[PDB]
Amino acid sequence: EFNVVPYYSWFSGITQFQKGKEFEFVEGQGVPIAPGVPATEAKGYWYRHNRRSFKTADGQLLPRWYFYYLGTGPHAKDQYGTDIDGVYWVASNQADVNTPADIVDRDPSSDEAIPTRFPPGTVLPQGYYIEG
Ligand SMILES: Nc1nc2c(ncn2[C@@H]2O[C@H](COP(=O)(O)O)[C@@H](O)[C@H]2O)c(=O)[nH]1
């Protein structure tokens, strides 16, 4: 979990389960589906949450990525496509990534997270499990 309240994603996360696998999408893909969001607004980034486990006397928590619309979240000020560790930029081919998405943040208990879903044809990154 988080010990500093996070910016809340509209969407469920995507969790790595196989080490060694890269988090990626084909250009033009990787924006999760939300009812009524026009394709011109489908732009943003996946943000990596590095997780850390406590030591036991048993025997390791892999990252989980969350989506933020362009101009929101923890990297709200960074330019689209800029090489930044833990940030993976995604956008519909219909989006102009020079402008922030006209999309209001989520929460409080106005709205639960939308289960992450992608349109038919989307190449899913192997080794990752989409929450929900
Ligand atoms: N605790 C926590 N919840 C978040 C965060 N980002 C937004 N959320 C919500 O937590 C859920 C993440 O999906 P889940 O990984 O639990 O399947 C999403 O519904 C997401 O919007 C976060 O950074 N920390």
Residue 8 CB–ligand 1 contact under 6 Å? yes
79-95: b or e for each residue (b if 16 or more CB lie within 10 Å)?
ebeeeeeebbbbbbeeb
Task: Report the alpha-carbon distance of residue 98 to residue 79 in Å, rounded.
Answer: 8
Contact between 96 and 47 under an 8 Å Cβ cutoff? The reply is no
Method for this entry: X-ray
The CA distances from residue 5 to 46, 114, 122, in Å, are 18, 19, 31
Taking the CB of residue 108, how many other CB atoms lie within 10 A of it? 6
Contact between 16 and 126 under an 8 Å Cβ cutoff? The reply is no
Q: Which of 4, 9, 75 to mutate to test the pocket of ligand 1 (most atoms within 8 A of CB)?
A: 9
